[PDB]
Amino acid sequence: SEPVTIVLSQMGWVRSAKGHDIDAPGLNYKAGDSFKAAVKGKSNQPVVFVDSTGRSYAIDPITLPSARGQGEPLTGKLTLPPGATVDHMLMESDDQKLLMASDAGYGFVCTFNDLVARNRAGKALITLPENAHVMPPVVIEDASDMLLAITQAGRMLMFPVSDLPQLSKGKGNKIINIPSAEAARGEDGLAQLYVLPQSTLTIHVGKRKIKLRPEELQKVTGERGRRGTLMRGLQRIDRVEIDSP
């Protein structure tokens, strides 16, 4: 057991660097490639990847190349579905709670252990509806945190993340109501999904700005699976700043 940092590149190449202090964007990349993400942990814990089809895969860091060199392709280690990409990387304690979801507005709470699939083809973790995509997984820091969902149409819904049932896999249960045919057409969908503590969100769309303190977020609180509250002009969000005590 020794501290490691796993570094993922834009082209899907990985390596395991010794220590937690490395300059990951400053590493050597192959021509046309560059930094995407880094996670940290211990050499005796798995690193997990989630692909664009909702499958998860675990790799033992001891099998990965070191910081020197340009890494090695994930396609040499994982059996990805045709056209799938590796979009997300996690390294957490076995029992760490996570929020998994699709942009059709369905999801579930699980633990990191539920993502750990050491076989080459990994595990079907989240089932995606027609033309749906995986949301970025969210590490749940406190069980009493609030889930905040914002749709492509500009509706917002907030409720305690404990309200969302825990599962080990599947489609999940409804987070926010988005009509399924509309989602399959790409006409609406879950655009942003957060787990927040007394947080404030500042959201920009071009030169328009809205600031939502706890007072304002109380106003979009509602029951899980409701359609949420429409905010005029809250479409094509391009900047979000979350200040979370």
PDB file of N, CA, C and O in Angstrom, residues 155-184:
ATOM      1  N   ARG A 155     -36.056  23.921 -15.655  1.00  0.00           N
ATOM      2  CA  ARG A 155     -36.773  23.669 -14.405  1.00  0.00           C
ATOM      3  C   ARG A 155     -35.810  23.207 -13.330  1.00  0.00           C
ATOM      4  O   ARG A 155     -34.857  22.495 -13.619  1.00  0.00           O
ATOM      5  N   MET A 156     -36.074  23.618 -12.091  1.00  0.00           N
ATOM      6  CA  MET A 156     -35.224  23.276 -10.944  1.00  0.00           C
ATOM      7  C   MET A 156     -36.032  22.551  -9.871  1.00  0.00           C
ATOM      8  O   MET A 156     -37.176  22.915  -9.564  1.00  0.00           O
ATOM      9  N   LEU A 157     -35.440  21.507  -9.309  1.00  0.00           N
ATOM     10  CA  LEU A 157     -36.071  20.788  -8.195  1.00  0.00           C
ATOM     11  C   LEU A 157     -35.014  20.441  -7.178  1.00  0.00           C
ATOM     12  O   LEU A 157     -33.949  19.968  -7.554  1.00  0.00           O
ATOM     13  N   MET A 158     -35.314  20.653  -5.900  1.00  0.00           N
ATOM     14  CA  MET A 158     -34.372  20.294  -4.824  1.00  0.00           C
ATOM     15  C   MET A 158     -35.096  19.425  -3.790  1.00  0.00           C
ATOM     16  O   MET A 158     -36.221  19.736  -3.400  1.00  0.00           O
ATOM     17  N   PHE A 159     -34.448  18.354  -3.334  1.00  0.00           N
ATOM     18  CA  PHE A 159     -34.989  17.536  -2.237  1.00  0.00           C
ATOM     19  C   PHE A 159     -33.828  16.797  -1.573  1.00  0.00           C
ATOM     20  O   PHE A 159     -32.762  16.670  -2.180  1.00  0.00           O
ATOM     21  N   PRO A 160     -34.015  16.333  -0.327  1.00  0.00           N
ATOM     22  CA  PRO A 160     -32.891  15.671   0.358  1.00  0.00           C
ATOM     23  C   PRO A 160     -32.439  14.431  -0.410  1.00  0.00           C
ATOM     24  O   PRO A 160     -33.270  13.645  -0.854  1.00  0.00           O
ATOM     25  N   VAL A 161     -31.126  14.258  -0.585  1.00  0.00           N
ATOM     26  CA  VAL A 161     -30.646  13.121  -1.381  1.00  0.00           C
ATOM     27  C   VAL A 161     -31.051  11.748  -0.770  1.00  0.00           C
ATOM     28  O   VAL A 161     -31.168  10.766  -1.503  1.00  0.00           O
ATOM     29  N   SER A 162     -31.279  11.709   0.551  1.00  0.00           N
ATOM     30  CA  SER A 162     -31.813  10.508   1.233  1.00  0.00           C
ATOM     31  C   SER A 162     -33.162  10.042   0.688  1.00  0.00           C
ATOM     32  O   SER A 162     -33.538   8.893   0.895  1.00  0.00           O
ATOM     33  N   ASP A 163     -33.901  10.930   0.021  1.00  0.00           N
ATOM     34  CA  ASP A 163     -35.184  10.581  -0.606  1.00  0.00           C
ATOM     35  C   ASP A 163     -35.044   9.650  -1.814  1.00  0.00           C
ATOM     36  O   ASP A 163     -36.007   8.971  -2.199  1.00  0.00           O
ATOM     37  N   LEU A 164     -33.857   9.611  -2.409  1.00  0.00           N
ATOM     38  CA  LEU A 164     -33.624   8.768  -3.559  1.00  0.00           C
ATOM     39  C   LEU A 164     -33.187   7.358  -3.130  1.00  0.00           C
ATOM     40  O   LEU A 164     -32.146   7.203  -2.461  1.00  0.00           O
ATOM     41  N   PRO A 165     -33.979   6.326  -3.488  1.00  0.00           N
ATOM     42  CA  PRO A 165     -33.662   4.966  -3.051  1.00  0.00           C
ATOM     43  C   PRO A 165     -32.282   4.493  -3.477  1.00  0.00           C
ATOM     44  O   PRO A 165     -31.793   4.839  -4.563  1.00  0.00           O
ATOM     45  N   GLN A 166     -31.663   3.712  -2.592  1.00  0.00           N
ATOM     46  CA  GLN A 166     -30.385   3.073  -2.862  1.00  0.00           C
ATOM     47  C   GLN A 166     -30.567   1.789  -3.672  1.00  0.00           C
ATOM     48  O   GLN A 166     -31.429   0.974  -3.365  1.00  0.00           O
ATOM     49  N   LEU A 167     -29.764   1.631  -4.718  1.00  0.00           N
ATOM     50  CA  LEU A 167     -29.753   0.437  -5.565  1.00  0.00           C
ATOM     51  C   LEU A 167     -28.309   0.051  -5.865  1.00  0.00           C
ATOM     52  O   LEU A 167     -27.391   0.849  -5.636  1.00  0.00           O
ATOM     53  N   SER A 168     -28.096  -1.161  -6.373  1.00  0.00           N
ATOM     54  CA  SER A 168     -26.734  -1.591  -6.754  1.00  0.00           C
ATOM     55  C   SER A 168     -26.538  -1.459  -8.253  1.00  0.00           C
ATOM     56  O   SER A 168     -25.412  -1.528  -8.743  1.00  0.00           O
ATOM     57  N   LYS A 169     -27.646  -1.302  -8.973  1.00  0.00           N
ATOM     58  CA  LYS A 169     -27.638  -1.103 -10.418  1.00  0.00           C
ATOM     59  C   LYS A 169     -29.066  -0.863 -10.913  1.00  0.00           C
ATOM     60  O   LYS A 169     -30.030  -0.978 -10.133  1.00  0.00           O
ATOM     61  N   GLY A 170     -29.195  -0.564 -12.206  1.00  0.00           N
ATOM     62  CA  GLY A 170     -30.500  -0.496 -12.891  1.00  0.00           C
ATOM     63  C   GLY A 170     -30.753   0.846 -13.543  1.00  0.00           C
ATOM     64  O   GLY A 170     -29.850   1.702 -13.631  1.00  0.00           O
ATOM     65  N   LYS A 171     -31.986   1.039 -13.997  1.00  0.00           N
ATOM     66  CA  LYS A 171     -32.388   2.337 -14.536  1.00  0.00           C
ATOM     67  C   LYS A 171     -32.402   3.387 -13.435  1.00  0.00           C
ATOM     68  O   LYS A 171     -32.099   4.561 -13.686  1.00  0.00           O
ATOM     69  N   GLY A 172     -32.746   2.962 -12.216  1.00  0.00           N
ATOM     70  CA  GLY A 172     -32.997   3.889 -11.132  1.00  0.00           C
ATOM     71  C   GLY A 172     -34.441   4.350 -11.055  1.00  0.00           C
ATOM     72  O   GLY A 172     -35.308   3.944 -11.856  1.00  0.00           O
ATOM     73  N   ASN A 173     -34.709   5.195 -10.071  1.00  0.00           N
ATOM     74  CA  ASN A 173     -36.048   5.737  -9.876  1.00  0.00           C
ATOM     75  C   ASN A 173     -36.050   7.200 -10.313  1.00  0.00           C
ATOM     76  O   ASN A 173     -34.989   7.810 -10.445  1.00  0.00           O
ATOM     77  N   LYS A 174     -37.235   7.757 -10.548  1.00  0.00           N
ATOM     78  CA  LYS A 174     -37.351   9.121 -11.034  1.00  0.00           C
ATOM     79  C   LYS A 174     -36.817  10.137 -10.020  1.00  0.00           C
ATOM     80  O   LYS A 174     -37.213  10.148  -8.839  1.00  0.00           O
ATOM     81  N   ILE A 175     -35.917  10.994 -10.499  1.00  0.00           N
ATOM     82  CA  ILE A 175     -35.399  12.142  -9.753  1.00  0.00           C
ATOM     83  C   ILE A 175     -36.283  13.359 -10.038  1.00  0.00           C
ATOM     84  O   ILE A 175     -36.781  14.006  -9.124  1.00  0.00           O
ATOM     85  N   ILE A 176     -36.475  13.647 -11.324  1.00  0.00           N
ATOM     86  CA  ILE A 176     -37.265  14.781 -11.766  1.00  0.00           C
ATOM     87  C   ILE A 176     -38.071  14.335 -12.984  1.00  0.00           C
ATOM     88  O   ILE A 176     -37.582  13.551 -13.797  1.00  0.00           O
ATOM     89  N   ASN A 177     -39.312  14.796 -13.106  1.00  0.00           N
ATOM     90  CA  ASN A 177     -40.147  14.320 -14.208  1.00  0.00           C
ATOM     91  C   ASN A 177     -39.817  14.999 -15.520  1.00  0.00           C
ATOM     92  O   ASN A 177     -39.981  16.204 -15.663  1.00  0.00           O
ATOM     93  N   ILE A 178     -39.307  14.214 -16.450  1.00  0.00           N
ATOM     94  CA  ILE A 178     -39.088  14.652 -17.826  1.00  0.00           C
ATOM     95  C   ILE A 178     -39.806  13.607 -18.695  1.00  0.00           C
ATOM     96  O   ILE A 178     -39.500  12.417 -18.618  1.00  0.00           O
ATOM     97  N   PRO A 179     -40.792  14.049 -19.485  1.00  0.00           N
ATOM     98  CA  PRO A 179     -41.547  13.112 -20.315  1.00  0.00           C
ATOM     99  C   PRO A 179     -40.594  12.284 -21.179  1.00  0.00           C
ATOM    100  O   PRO A 179     -39.689  12.834 -21.801  1.00  0.00           O
ATOM    101  N   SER A 180     -40.793  10.971 -21.190  1.00  0.00           N
ATOM    102  CA  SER A 180     -39.798  10.076 -21.771  1.00  0.00           C
ATOM    103  C   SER A 180     -39.623  10.243 -23.267  1.00  0.00           C
ATOM    104  O   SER A 180     -38.511  10.130 -23.794  1.00  0.00           O
ATOM    105  N   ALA A 181     -40.730  10.451 -23.975  1.00  0.00           N
ATOM    106  CA  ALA A 181     -40.630  10.660 -25.417  1.00  0.00           C
ATOM    107  C   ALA A 181     -39.882  11.958 -25.743  1.00  0.00           C
ATOM    108  O   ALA A 181     -39.074  12.020 -26.681  1.00  0.00           O
ATOM    109  N   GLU A 182     -40.120  12.999 -24.948  1.00  0.00           N
ATOM    110  CA  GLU A 182     -39.413  14.259 -25.116  1.00  0.00           C
ATOM    111  C   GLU A 182     -37.889  14.099 -24.864  1.00  0.00           C
ATOM    112  O   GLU A 182     -37.051  14.611 -25.617  1.00  0.00           O
ATOM    113  N   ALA A 183     -37.539  13.348 -23.821  1.00  0.00           N
ATOM    114  CA  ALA A 183     -36.141  13.084 -23.511  1.00  0.00           C
ATOM    115  C   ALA A 183     -35.487  12.274 -24.627  1.00  0.00           C
ATOM    116  O   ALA A 183     -34.366  12.561 -25.012  1.00  0.00           O
ATOM    117  N   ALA A 184     -36.193  11.279 -25.162  1.00  0.00           N
ATOM    118  CA  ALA A 184     -35.630  10.456 -26.218  1.00  0.00           C
ATOM    119  C   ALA A 184     -35.389  11.270 -27.494  1.00  0.00           C
ATOM    120  O   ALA A 184     -34.511  10.929 -28.284  1.00  0.00           O
TER     121      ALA A 184
END
